[PDB]
Amino acid sequence: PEMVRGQVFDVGPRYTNLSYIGEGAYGMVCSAYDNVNKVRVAIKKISPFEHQTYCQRTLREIKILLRFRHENIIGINDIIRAPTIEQMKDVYIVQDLMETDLYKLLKTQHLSNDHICYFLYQILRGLKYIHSANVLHRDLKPSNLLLNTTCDLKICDFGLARVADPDHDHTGFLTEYVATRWYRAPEIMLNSKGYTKSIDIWSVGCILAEMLSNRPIFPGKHYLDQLNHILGILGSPSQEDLNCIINLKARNYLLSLPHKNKVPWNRLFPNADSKALDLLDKMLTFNPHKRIEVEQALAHPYLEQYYDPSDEPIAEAPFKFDMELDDLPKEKLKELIFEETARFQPG
Ligand SMILES: *CCC(=O)Nc1ccccc1Nc1nc(Nc2cncc(OC)c2)ncc1C(F)(F)F
Structure with missing residues (x-):
């Protein structure tokens, strides 16, 4: 051998x-x-x-x-x-x-707006098919996006994937989680098991932000520091978004924090296309119910040159095995x- x-x-x-x-x-x-x-x-x-x-x-x-x-x-x-x-x-x-992955590309290469747009389109196109199969990837990050020499993109590593289970998504505050910290949606640290499609949209949002500047947008150094980073940019959640967090430990933690202002996307990303930033805002929405879905993200004006729902296939059937191997x-x-x-x- x-x-x-x-x-x-x-x-x-x-x-x-x-x-x-x-x-x-x-x-x-x-x-x-x-x-x-x-x-x-x-x-x-x-x-x-x-x-x-x-x-x-x-x-x-x-x-x-x-x-x-x-x-x-x-x-x-x-x-x-x-x-x-x-x-x-x-x-x-x-x-x-494949030639490389997005993590290696971002550490070495400036991305044109045209490359950002095509990468984002392909991530969402792959994600539309995954979500149509009632599957959550749950670990979307630049090292799980492979590229060939012509910049075709493929999503890899479904080792952390699950069948969607929105009715069983609720948990307590500071509940431990497996998926990569910098791409973790704020609700994971607050009241979510990461059993809804909105968890993957957040990660794509973080990947889009990282393609715009070559640097992770929310580089938390530990479990609760991840939330510190997100809130530093999004600013304090609204009363309405807090009212959706019923769990008292999670609610009161957010209420204990000094008021933080939203950092405008166009200040953080001065060279970015304004339509790219409108879509980013919608992907990186604090409240998972208000967060854009994959199909809406595909239909966004930023991606108009590529958008073609007849050429954005879905799965023939939902994925049967609910995750029951546990x-x-x-x-x-x-x-x-x-x-x-x-x-x-x-x-
Ligand atoms: C899906 C994640 C993964 O497998 N990534 C990874 C990481 C480190 C080495 C190899 C792979 N997989 C992989 N790599 C390539 N091509 C490639 C060539 N030169 C450098 C890199 O850096 C990562 C990658 N092609 C295919 C794969 C595949 F996933 F399919 F096995």
Whole structure:
């Protein structure tokens, strides 16, 4: 078997000429020449079978990405594993090789308004399809947006994704949460489990702001500091928006804070297109009920050059498996991963 950087990367014989790319969320990623469709591909090594959390996440991503078919959503081309459960230690996921991701691009490259507009359109186009399947991505951020050499964009990493559940969204104040801090909607820290579509719109809003300046808009250093950043720009919530927070701990915390003024978008972003800032304002609305939805965001004047609802497909069916893998142990999960990957085995 092939070795990379003191690591078994056991993908051959179909996949050869391995080049290390980097480390992703939970393991080694290489490029490799695919001897069947004669292209280089991306391959990530997943070794999840020891920890139940890794298993739940691996299974979610596999079930979701195999069901989804969309130009702005990374596919799975191939899955490599051992022929038996007993021999299966790692899973290799084979995906289109992309030039970069938005996180690497923002650290090195100024974006023209035209590039911002096209990136934003494709994020929303992919997101319309995800949300139409009753799925929440829940971890949208620049490193989960892949780009090829012609700036086509694909959403990746559905490991934290869930079926939408708006009726069970309420929780207490300062409830712990898994998804990436800087892209977390203010309601997460106040009264939300992140079980509604509005959670993803907030993250897209943060990504749009970060494309305008190359810097995260709300770079919190800890759980409650995240809220400090958001309120520093949005200013104090209105009485009406507070009245929607019924939980007393969350309400009273907000009431305890000194009054803060809204920082106008055009001061924060002096070079930005005014229509881009109108859409940003609507995505970064404090109150999740008043926050723009994906389809409304697509219809916004900023995106008029691209908007074409007949060419913005939705999913054939909602995603069935509600998230109910939560109670399943590592061993049933290994079995389910084995089953879900069976189609990529010779015959
Ligand atoms: C979906 C998130 C992810 O897999 N990101 C990531 C992170 C680090 C290394 C590799 C990947 N995946 C990935 N990368 C490329 N292409 C690429 C090439 N040169 C640099 C980078 O920096 C991240 C990425 N293509 C495809 C993938 C894929 F996700 F499909 F496996």
